[PDB]
Amino acid sequence: FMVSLPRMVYPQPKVLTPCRKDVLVVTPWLAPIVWEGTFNIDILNEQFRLQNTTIGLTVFAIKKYVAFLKLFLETAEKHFMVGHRVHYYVFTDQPAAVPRVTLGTGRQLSVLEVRAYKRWQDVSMRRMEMISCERRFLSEVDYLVCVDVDMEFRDHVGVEILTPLFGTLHPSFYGSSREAFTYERRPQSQAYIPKDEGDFYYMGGFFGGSVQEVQRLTRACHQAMMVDQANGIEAVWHDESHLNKYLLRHKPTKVLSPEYLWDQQLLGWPAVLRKLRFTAVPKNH
Numbered sequence: 001f002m003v004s005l006p007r008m009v010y011p012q013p014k015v016l017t018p019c020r021k022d023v024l025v026v027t028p029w030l031a032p033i034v035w036e037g038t039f040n041i042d043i044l045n046e047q048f049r050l051q052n053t054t055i056g057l058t059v060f061a062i063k064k065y066v067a068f069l070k071l072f073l074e075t076a077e078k079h080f081m082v083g084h085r086v087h088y089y090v091f092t093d094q095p096a097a098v099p100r101v102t103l104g105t106g107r108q109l110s111v112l113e114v115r116a117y118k119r120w121q122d123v124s125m126r127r128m129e130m131i132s133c134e135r136r137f138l139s140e141v142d143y144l145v146c147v148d149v150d151m152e153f154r155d156h157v158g159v160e161i162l163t164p165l166f167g168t169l170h171p172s173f174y175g176s177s178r179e180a181f182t183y184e185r186r187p188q189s190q191a192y193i194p195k196d197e198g199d200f201y202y203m204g205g206f207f208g209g210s211v212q213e214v215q216r217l218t219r220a221c222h223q224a225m226m227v228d229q230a231n232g233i234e235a236v237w238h239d240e241s242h243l244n245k246y247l248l249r250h251k252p253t254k255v256l257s258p259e260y261l262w263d264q265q266l267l268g269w270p271a272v273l274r275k276l277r278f279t280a281v282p283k284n285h
């Protein structure tokens, strides 16, 4: 049950003027595409705080990638869901290497020890299995957001993203035609997508939703990866290829624009991006 919003004074939405004319702001299945200009964060904050929303954030930091946690967590404290309840879940092979970062009120961090795989591909792929921590998340958070750790927040990432299921437009492909997308193209893989299919190319480094929908997604991607392994095939972009297949066949209820996962060194700051909110930290692969 949702109580009434309080009185609020803000600019009237004008029906005969779009918030953004340069970009697509709603998918053909009526899911908002979240860009700056399209939302009033004060209305959204009221709606979500009145539900006492708790957001879980998962991040994996295996092997050398523990070095990214300090900046990731400190910048998450300045920009990710401030004002709301947040539970960080740090999955790592080295619990003693997790930095002690100071958290704001209503925010907590859990360290979850996992095994390290040798190949960076298996580390990245096995997050789907590891996420699908099932009973624990249902009890502790309302939404789960799953991200890469080699990143920093530079601007607001808030409750405008929350919805039953979302993916994020990959920053290298948002202007690309679908035949250029790097989907898995071999019909022998479960992740296969033909050249005449595909809405968007979603980034493996930032997806989320309600706990139920995220567990559906991660279970389905982990089962599809197991089928490929048993067939001796590994998708071209690993868990990202499987997430793309899943989101083609289960449309997300919101799509985040590339504001939400950007790489300034590789792609600069185009005018269609008013804000760069969560951005790659340069590293040597």
Ligand SMILES: O=c1ccn([C@@H]2O[C@H](COP(=O)(O)OP(=O)(O)O)[C@@H](O)[C@H]2O)c(=O)[nH]1
Pocket: 059, 060, 061, 062, 063, 064, 065, 120, 123, 124, 147, 148, 149, 150, 205, 285
């Ligand atoms: O040795 C590794 C390799 C991968 N990762 C995790 O898997 C994510 C995806 O891998 P990566 O960021 O290397 O992929 P890229 O963004 O460079 O394509 C990393 O952000 C970490 O969260 C990790 O922790 N340790």
Ligand SMILES: OC[C@H]1O[C@@H](O)[C@H](O)[C@@H](O)[C@H]1O
Pocket: 170, 172, 182, 204, 237, 240
């Ligand atoms: O083609 C897809 C690839 O695009 C890269 O630009 C990104 O660094 C990889 O992680 C994978 O997403």
Ligand SMILES: [Mn+2]
Pocket: 148, 149, 150, 205
């Ligand atoms: Mn990454």
